[PDB]
């Protein structure tokens, strides 16, 4: 338990990542958003209305 809490303190002390020479690389693709909305009722309906307004 003391080494666990001291590892928390180790993070608080010198956790910041030293960038250089990756030991291994992981090729994934995520971590922001994977959303297309797929519900082209709104997007095309506003476009519809805007085109009617312009023309």
């Amino acid at each position: 338990q003391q080494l666990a809490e001291q590892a928390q303190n180790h993070w608080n002390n010198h956790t910041q990542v030293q960038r250089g020479n990756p030991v291994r690389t992981f090729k994934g693709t995520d971590f922001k958003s994977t959303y297309v909305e797929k519900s082209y009722k709104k997007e095309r309906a506003e476009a519809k209305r805007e085109i009617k307004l312009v023309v």
């Binding site: 922001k32 958003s33 959303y35 909305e37």
Partner: protein, 123 residues
Amino acid sequence: ATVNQLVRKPRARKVAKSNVPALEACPQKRGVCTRVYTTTPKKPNSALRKVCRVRLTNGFEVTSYIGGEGHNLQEHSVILIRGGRVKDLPGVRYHTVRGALDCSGVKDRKQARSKYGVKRPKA
């Protein structure tokens, strides 16, 4: 609909509650930033919206949006909240006033300055 029915029991109108209950009908309220952080919006938006758990004077503890680009807010930063909902953030119903008591203005904003507490730049 029948007039006797109304006489016995009148029209009970819609009672309506405020959607900014912490301000207690006050246009702005001072609060202390308990926590300053960023949170992910809900779908379909995506960002790291800047927000702060703030403890008002009236005792309430709410969560307040930090408008504008870049801020100096930290723990214990005394700020004002003004009400105003952030739709794409669940349970964030107050906007932090810029230029208000700790919250410095937006750095290098040249238009719509007043909503962010930025002075008129001098030539």
